[PDB]
Ligand binder design. Sequence first.
Ligand SMILES: NC(=O)c1ccc[n+]([C@@H]2O[C@H](COP(=O)([O-])OP(=O)(O)OC[C@H]3O[C@@H](n4cnc5c(N)ncnc54)[C@H](O)[C@@H]3O)[C@@H](O)[C@H]2O)c1
Ligand SMILES: NC(=O)c1ccc[n+]([C@@H]2O[C@H](COP(=O)([O-])OP(=O)(O)OC[C@H]3O[C@@H](n4cnc5c(N)ncnc54)[C@H](O)[C@@H]3O)[C@@H](O)[C@H]2O)c1
Ligand SMILES: CCCCCCCCCCCC(=O)O
Ligand SMILES: CCCCCCCCCCCC(=O)O
Ligand SMILES: [K+]
Ligand SMILES: [K+]
Ligand SMILES: [Zn+2]
Ligand SMILES: [Zn+2]
Ligand SMILES: [Zn+2]
Ligand SMILES: [Zn+2]
Lengths: 373, 373
Amino acid sequence: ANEVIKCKAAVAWEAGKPLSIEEIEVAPPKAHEVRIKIIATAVCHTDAYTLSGADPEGCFPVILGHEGAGIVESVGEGVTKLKAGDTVIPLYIPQCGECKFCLNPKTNLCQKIRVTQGKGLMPDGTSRFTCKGKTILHYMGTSTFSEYTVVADISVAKIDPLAPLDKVCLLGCGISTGYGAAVNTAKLEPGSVCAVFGLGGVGLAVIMGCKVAGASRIIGVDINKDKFARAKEFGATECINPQDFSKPIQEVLIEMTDGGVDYSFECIGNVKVMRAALEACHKGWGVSVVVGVAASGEEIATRPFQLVTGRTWKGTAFGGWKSVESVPKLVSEYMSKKIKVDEFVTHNLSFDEINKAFELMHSGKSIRTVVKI
Amino acid sequence: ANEVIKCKAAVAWEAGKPLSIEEIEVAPPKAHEVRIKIIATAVCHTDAYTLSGADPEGCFPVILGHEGAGIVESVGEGVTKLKAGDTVIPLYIPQCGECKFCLNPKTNLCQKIRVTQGKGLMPDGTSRFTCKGKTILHYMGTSTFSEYTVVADISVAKIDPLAPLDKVCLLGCGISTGYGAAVNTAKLEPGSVCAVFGLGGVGLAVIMGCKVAGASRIIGVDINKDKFARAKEFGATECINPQDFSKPIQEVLIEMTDGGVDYSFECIGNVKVMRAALEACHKGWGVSVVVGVAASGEEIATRPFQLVTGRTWKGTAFGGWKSVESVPKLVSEYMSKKIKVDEFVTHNLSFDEINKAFELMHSGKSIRTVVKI
Ligand SMILES: NC(=O)c1ccc[n+]([C@@H]2O[C@H](COP(=O)([O-])OP(=O)(O)OC[C@H]3O[C@@H](n4cnc5c(N)ncnc54)[C@H](O)[C@@H]3O)[C@@H](O)[C@H]2O)c1
Ligand SMILES: NC(=O)c1ccc[n+]([C@@H]2O[C@H](COP(=O)([O-])OP(=O)(O)OC[C@H]3O[C@@H](n4cnc5c(N)ncnc54)[C@H](O)[C@@H]3O)[C@@H](O)[C@H]2O)c1
Ligand SMILES: CCCCCCCCCCCC(=O)O
Ligand SMILES: CCCCCCCCCCCC(=O)O
Ligand SMILES: [K+]
Ligand SMILES: [K+]
Ligand SMILES: [Zn+2]
Ligand SMILES: [Zn+2]
Ligand SMILES: [Zn+2]
Ligand SMILES: [Zn+2]
């Protein structure tokens, strides 16, 4: 029988405060739920955004984390596709395969459990986390900052049992998104001229995707020149710092590409840079893809003339990958050396030092920090 | 030998005043130029905007008009594809077929003569119009408000001699644009749910295109309910007036379609409605195409969230048709009865009554007025 598990977890008691390593209780999985033992997890800007209290959708107390990889500890009633021991990756974008969205080839945004997930609850409307007598909320349907988490069965990707979990946990978000933005959303053709704004883990994954697709030019853009070396290693043909120019970055890109790039990607979350990314696109056929998540309230803008004269403005969520069916394949692409993963890991920490990952992220000195549970 | 031609034309001496029927001189065609005898010309809000004086690029004196059909009166040196007698349609969007744009399948925006055309001049930098001792400027590279006009040899579509010129003159603008917006820019699939904002000639052509593509639902939107009857005749499954609802129009549409439309088309030129059109699109795969030409300086806006969650913002110019090769085919589709043209004509006038065409536009009681030269 599946019992209540007593384990450690990094709890976010309140907005604006660091995470606290607490002893918590994890209820057994109910019908169509899966309990997972998290082996490794990474931290992303989104976890920090929610933690800051700036996220109008954020609620506390809560167990954050959405970039993890683990092993199935037990499954609830009705679950047959998964079993104890399976190697998996929690998914914040599920795939029920039955809804209006899963049935449509043009999207990956399953809506089956979005309502409850937004409230930090399981599909049945309750939470499996408790701590010191209080209910602790789930986050993005994953809550990877715990030794053991419980997710909806449609929020799980079964992967290659040989994949090193302290590496593939990154496919839970950043890598997959940037890579998918290039090959799924933009679908850039061989020989394309591209520009990538923001050279963090996401931008690097975009560059990686542009190289896989055979781009002829990949121009990285970042105000932090320390990001350049790794950008080139990933495939950037050149990097520029908007701070070195006196004219708008879009004019610079237009100037160095004889009209503008074929595809641009904003991987920062700056509405002003998003406009520049669109305007840096070549007249007639340029396509700009928004990947960054802007603070709530912020709006993007430009003159309709930009679209009338040929440019297209797109966006992407988790690289457009239908999660459950795609993630296993991304793991296989990693195992076969088609895509990189290890190269995104810049720092490693133990669970007790989880807050240092947030510090490294804000010091701007890391791409991705993997936390060993 | 080609001599100077004295003829009648509707001259716009200054902004904010009615066109003046004058006698003018039309120089012969220089190298790579074609002089055309205009048989019929229509009028649309773009001609009126320039005349209003609100166009930051409107210069006077000028001979307006960009919707025409006629016969080649004579050609200049080096012109061998066209000859006197050919039936043709002048094009404000040329097709040199040799520039980077004409060679790229994703666009129809030939740039070979845009600079001079924008200055109301032929490619050689001069004008062929004179009147009362004053040089008169060309307009949109067509100047169809004259018995005779001269245009670049790459601004000409050779069409079926049997086509009725007082009809196909509308294919030089509105009809082609709306139709193309649906089948070239949107490329909507059979069964698509569509919304068309603005039911003028452009919107009706979009509806016509949606029907040809096999759209399942076509919702027409306009603040003037008198535009509804004809919209339904063209294929709209229903029409709604934004004024009849207290909620923003995009909220009404989302409600009416269980999520939003698959494709929306803005055929007005109102940035606020352009935003509504985008937000009225369905999450995950919705696509909005801006067809309307907004006033200078105005800009469109929305929250990047809209793009990140699946929507796409596009625009179109002359329906994306590579002008020289497409117009003849569009004429053929009309001849074959695949598309409508005659149904767009709401009024007919003689050349001397040309100003009345503008009066009809202001009263909002016309789609297209055809002026017989
Ligand atoms: N759409 C999605 O599904 C999805 C998925 C994951 C992440 N994201 C978003 O992607 C964005 C990037 O994630 P990340 O982990 O790579 O973040 P990151 O902070 O590590 O990288 C962002 C980079 O932007 C650079 N930058 C900041 N201002 C700049 C400017 N004005 N011009 C050029 N560069 C500038 C920074 O130096 C940094 O290197 C974030 O907004 C994240 O929330 C979106
Ligand atoms: N992109 C192109 O290549 C291209 C080509 C031709 C025309 N255009 C532009 O297309 C637009 C329309 O051309 P047209 O000939 O059909 O003009 P039109 O005036 O005949 O049509 C405009 C319609 O929009 C309706 N309308 C006005 N405000 C509205 C609102 N708030 N909500 C709903 N409907 C509203 C008007 O009542 C009218 O029925 C103009 O901007 C024109 O310049 C663009
Ligand atoms: C770590 C980055 C995660 C941010 C995810 C961005 C994806 C937005 C889609 C969520 C909205 C929806 O599913 O209806
Ligand atoms: C009849 C009015 C239509 C006016 C056309 C609007 C399209 C503007 C695009 C300009 C073309 C270019 O810059 O190459
Ligand atoms: K593509
Ligand atoms: K399409
Ligand atoms: Zn992340
Ligand atoms: Zn689903
Ligand atoms: Zn017109
Ligand atoms: Zn050209």
